[PDB]
């Protein structure tokens, strides 16, 4: 994919955001911003320019399922890639997110290779 693709990394834990951002850099992606919950995320997304969202689920203010659903329902950003990265491991969680339009889904804890693999799976599906 285009190495100037702008990512929004959303998680209420700064340690996780740091992990994801550093994995993105290793993969060649340096245009990366962070948000701390779904409301902060939507503020940055409204600010413009984003091409990919990586998001947690359990966050205050707006959780990642609501964030995903808001994005998919919004005409200005309905096809924006959203990769879920969450400790929610139950099949019903995965179903709710998949059905809500998740581009992909990774369960914490996760390896570097898994994130890379699932990002590349989304790129290939979208022809990025
Ligand atoms: F708090 Be997240 F769903 F890992
Ligand atoms: Mn969380």
Curated annotation (Swiss-Prot):
MF terms in GO: acetyltransferase activity; magnesium ion binding; phosphorelay response regulator activity
Gene Ontology CC terms: bacterial-type flagellum; bacterial-type flagellum basal body, C ring; bacterial-type flagellum rotor complex; cytoplasm; cytosol
Post-translational changes noted in the entry: Phosphorylated by CheA or acetylated by acetyl-CoA synthetase, depending on which acetate metabolism pathway is available. The major acetylation site seems to be Lys-91. Dephosphorylated (inactivated) by CheZ.
Compartment list: Cytoplasm
InterPro entries: CheY-like_superfamily (IPR011006), Sig_transdc_resp-reg_receiver (IPR001789), ST_Response_Regulator (IPR052048)
Keyword set, alphabetical order: Acetylation, Chemotaxis, Cytoplasm, Flagellar rotation, Magnesium, Metal-binding, Phosphoprotein, Two-component regulatory system
Effect of residue 91 to R: No effect on chemotaxis
Entry's cofactor comment: Binds 1 Mg(2+) ion per subunit.
SMART domains: REC
SUPFAM superfamilies documented for this protein: CheY-like
Residue numbers carrying 4-aspartylphosphate: 56
Function statement: Involved in the transmission of sensory signals from the chemoreceptors to the flagellar motors. In its active (phosphorylated or acetylated) form, CheY exhibits enhanced binding to a switch component, FliM, at the flagellar motor which induces a change from counterclockwise to clockwise flagellar rotation. Overexpression of CheY in association with MotA and MotB improves motility of a ycgR disruption, suggesting there is an interaction (direct or indirect) between the c-di-GMP-binding flagellar brake protein and the flagellar stator.
Protein name per the record: Chemotaxis protein CheY
């Amino acid at each position: 994919a285009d190495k100037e693709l702008k990512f929004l990394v959303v998680d209420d834990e700064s340690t996780m955001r740091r992990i994801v951002r550093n994995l993105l850099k290793e993969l060649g992606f340096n245009n990366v911003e962070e948000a701390e919950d779904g409301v902060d995320a939507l503020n940055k997304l409204q600010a413009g320019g984003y091409g990919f969202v990586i998001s947690d689920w359990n966050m205050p203010n707006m959780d990642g399922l609501e964030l995903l659903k808001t994005i998919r329902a919004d005409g200005a950003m309905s096809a924006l890639p959203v990769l879920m990265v969450t400790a929610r491991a139950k099949k019903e969680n995965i179903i709710a997110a998949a059905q809500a339009g998740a581009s992909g889904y990774v369960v914490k804890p996760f390896t570097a290779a898994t994130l890379e693999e699932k990002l590349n799976k989304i790129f290939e599906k979208l022809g990025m």
